[PDB]
Amino acid sequence: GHKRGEQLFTGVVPILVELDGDVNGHRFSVRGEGEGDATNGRLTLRFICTTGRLPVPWPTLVTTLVQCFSRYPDHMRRHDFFKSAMPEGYVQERTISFRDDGTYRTRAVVRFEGNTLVNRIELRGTNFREDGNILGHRLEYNYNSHNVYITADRQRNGIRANFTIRHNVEDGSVQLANHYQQNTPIGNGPVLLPDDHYLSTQTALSRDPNERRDHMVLLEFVTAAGIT
Ligand SMILES: [Cu+2]
């Protein structure tokens, strides 16, 4: 499926993100729109909290809110699981453990709906501290560069990823978010299962001065590396 998969991403692809979330019994929804340019490994997205203020810091949802837009160099094309699963797409599941705080469990469907790449997510957050960094909104509105370590999950016919996000805290400390990720294709067609490699992920967060709703503007650059 990789030949057709690659062809789906050679241009600029519209993106829709829909997240329904419940954190410590606080229900919220996020809607995101923008576009992806996999050739350049570039995402540009605008996210709105449609339900009110986000009950958690925007930066904590970045990983949850489309690794099919990663730039896989030609010499790594046989290691691109994400595109090879398209258009039928994949299920992306995570446990995100915040050190000394609560846990997110996420399930997402990532697939084409017509010419749009859609990320539809359910998130459940449990055991957050009422006056921790997360529910207290003491995380800086910024984002560090990270490596996403990818390994094949042959039994699942998919991939696993492990990485730790470092969230800057307003007091100059760091909040760690331990990410456990698994991806499973939805379709029956063949997918590429990769050799061990990583996604070099860079994220810039900004605000829209014209927007009254709680929101996040995101630019992301993602390149596959670690195979010579
Ligand atoms: Cu293929």
Residue numbers in the entry: 0 to 64, 66 to 228
Pull verbatim passages from the article behind this deposition.
Here, the high-affinity copper(II)-binding tripeptide GHK was fused to the N-terminus of a GFP variant and an MBP-FG peptide fusion. The GHK tag promoted crystallization, with various residues (His, Asp, His/Pro) from symmetry molecules completing the copper(II) square-pyramidal coordination sphere. Rapid structure determination by copper SAD phasing could be achieved, even at a very low Bijvoet ratio or after significant radiation damage. We further show that an N-terminally fused GHK peptide can be utilized in standard crystallographic methods to enhance the crystallization of proteins and to provide reliable phasing sites for structure solution with minimal effort.
